């Protein structure tokens, strides 16, 4: 009988309960997006990588949901390598930031995916 840990066990939604993705796994998730015609984009956050409530408390209001966009969504991107190269540029510039890959479905007209691609040391 194991007791689920309490300290430093913050999660980042989809796929965050699995062992961290290898470059191959990461590339396979990116291909899923491309094959579905979804637009990939990267987001990073250096301050609080988790949800909190500072500016308001009414139902459905939370701070920390929006992170900052790395460049622009990658319209027309056809190669998972392009995306992963960007993840590298981003990590190079923000080695202290959490980085996640998100995707947009222009037909459903909504953001449709979001998975942590990089966590800074000790997370």
């Amino acid at each position: 009988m194991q007791v689920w840990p309490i300290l430093n066990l913050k999660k980042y939604e989809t796929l965050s309960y699995l062992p961290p993705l290898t470059t191959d796994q990461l590339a396979r998730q990116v291909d899923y997006l491309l094959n579905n015609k979804w637009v990939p984009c990267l987001e990073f956050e250096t301050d609080h990588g988790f949800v909190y409530r500072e500016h308001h408390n009414s139902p459905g209001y939370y701070d920390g949901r929006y992170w900052t966009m790395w460049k622009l969504p990658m319209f027309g991107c056809t190669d998972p390598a392009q995306v992963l190269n960007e993840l590298e540029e981003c990590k190079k510039e923000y080695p202290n930031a959490f980085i996640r890959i998100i995707g947009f479905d222009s037909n459903r007209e909504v953001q449709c995916i979001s998975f942590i691609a990089y966590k800074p040391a000790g997370y």
């Binding site: 194991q2 989809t14 309960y17 699995l18 009414s58 995916i113």
Partner: protein, 455 residues
């Protein structure tokens, strides 16, 4: 309509059976499964269903001459035999837009289903489907939020959401109830839930439950960093009590409330739906009592009709049963009403029980909730059948884990994420489900423990 009076009984048939009728885009269409009494021919039965759910009177009345009743009558415009059933037919009936009160599901059901089911010429009657015209759809608010907005508020993407009903439903004190809630949420589930029966009772008054559940959910959210919710049941005896409950949930700043729409009723449900929209609260709908009406094939109303009504009145989630434990066909029927709940347009498809093409003119979709005897081994199946836009609920499947609620939650969250990753990599969930689960047990003691207990 009209007259040259002369009182007396008279006959339906010619007046209500209009096989030549071309339906209007503004008409509400109904598909009734009619089982006539022996000796009643099909045309006669169909005409009776139409007359009895609109203007048919048992004896001529002079006032009909003050209007044009043709403009108001229901019309049986088509009849077709049911295969593998003797003396059973599908009769299609058209109702003019003008018979209905705008925005009132209560009036829609009263008009179509309020009287016909007791007609003596029929042995049994079942409403299978309704085509709600877009001009009537526009008179309703629909879901307070709907699929797209819910995911955006919660910041949850690319996988089914996960919940857990707290058990035992009755018996726990508000505080022990909240303790169970915190242990479940901290393990990775997105929501916890009040049983449909949990309103306000001697051992656990509602306000105390709402309060401890709030403490538990905020603690789990702070610990995990992921947004959490607990479906706080607002179902009550009067509109006033229901509103008091919704108002306190608002005060607590929590994200979601719950209502048993059939036992509470459509009038109260529409009130709560409007309040949730105005206050930013998600609304989880429980279908308690549905089987009293939708179970038997020969009499009642099929659940797809009760699901359309809920999408109009309003709800963000609705229980749709599990597809597990049933043969195809029943699997196909479920997938059929699931499309009717989520999509903007669904084409007629008799193989899935969809009798009419249905458009929703951008009314938000409702998230279907799969619940009922499910555990980790059904995960590949559920993910395959429902896709991402669904809520999978595990009551016994979570609180029944050998190490407790938290590990029970971890097991379910890992099992789900393993399936999502596999599907995304191109693996066949239908063929490789058990292998996907087993591989995950290699690195997840929590999942391995669960897999040992069930199936």
């Amino acid at each position: 309509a009209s007259v040259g009076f002369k009182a007396g009984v008279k006959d339906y048939k010619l007046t209500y059976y209009t096989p030549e009728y071309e339906t209007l885009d503004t008409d509400i269409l109904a598909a009734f499964r009619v089982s006539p009494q022996p000796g009643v021919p099909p045309e006669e039965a169909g005409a009776a269903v139409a007359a009895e759910s609109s203007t048919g009177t048992w004896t001529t009345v002079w006032t009909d001459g003050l209007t044009n009743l043709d403009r108001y009558k229901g019309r049986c415009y088509h009849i077709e035999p049911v295969a593998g059933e003797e003396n059973q037919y599908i009769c299609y009936v058209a109702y003019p837009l003008d018979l209905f009160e705008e925005g009132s599901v209560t009036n829609m059901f009263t008009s179509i289903v309020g009287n016909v089911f007791g007609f003596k010429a029929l042995r049994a009657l079942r409403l299978e489907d309704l085509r709600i015209p877009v001009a009537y759809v526009k008179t309703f608010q629909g879901p307070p939020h709907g699929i797209q907005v819910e995911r955006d508020k919660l910041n949850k993407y690319g996988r089914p959401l996960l919940g857990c009903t707290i058990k035992p439903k009755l018996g726990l004190s508000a505080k022990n109830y909240g303790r169970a809630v915190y242990e479940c949420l901290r393990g990775g589930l997105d929501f916890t839930k009040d049983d449909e029966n949990v309103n306000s009772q001697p051992f656990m008054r509602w306000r105390d439950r709402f309060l401890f559940c709030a403490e538990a959910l905020y603690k789990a959210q702070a610990e995990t960093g992921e947004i959490k919710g607990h479906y706080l049941n607002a179902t009550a005896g009067t509109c006033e009590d229901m509103m008091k409950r919704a108002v306190f949930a608002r005060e607590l700043g929590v994200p979601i409330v719950m209502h048993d729409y059939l036992t509470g009723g459509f009038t109260a449900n529409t009130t709560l739906s409007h309040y949730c929209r105005d206050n930013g609260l998600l609304l989880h709908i429980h279908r308690a009592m549905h089987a009293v009406i939708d179970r038997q094939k020969n009499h009642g109303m099929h659940f797809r009709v009760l699901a359309k009504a809920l999408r109009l009145s309003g709800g963000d989630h609705i229980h749709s049963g599990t597809v597990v434990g049933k043969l195809e066909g029943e699997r196909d029927i479920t997938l059929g009403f699931v499309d009717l709940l989520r999509d903007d347009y669904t084409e007629k498809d008799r193989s899935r029980g969809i009798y009419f093409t249905q458009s929703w003119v951008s009314t938000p979709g409702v998230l279907p909730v799969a619940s009922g005897g499910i555990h980790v081994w059904h995960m590949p199946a559920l993910t395959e059948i429902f896709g991402d836009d669904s809520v999978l609920q595990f009551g016994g499947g979570t609180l029944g884990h050998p190490w407790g609620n938290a590990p029970g939650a971890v097991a379910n969250r890992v099992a789900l994420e393993a399936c999502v990753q596999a599907r995304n990599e191109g693996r066949d969930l239908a063929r490789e489900g058990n292998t996907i689960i087993r591989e995950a047990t290699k690195w997840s003691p929590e999942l391995a423990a669960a897999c040992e207990v069930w199936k």
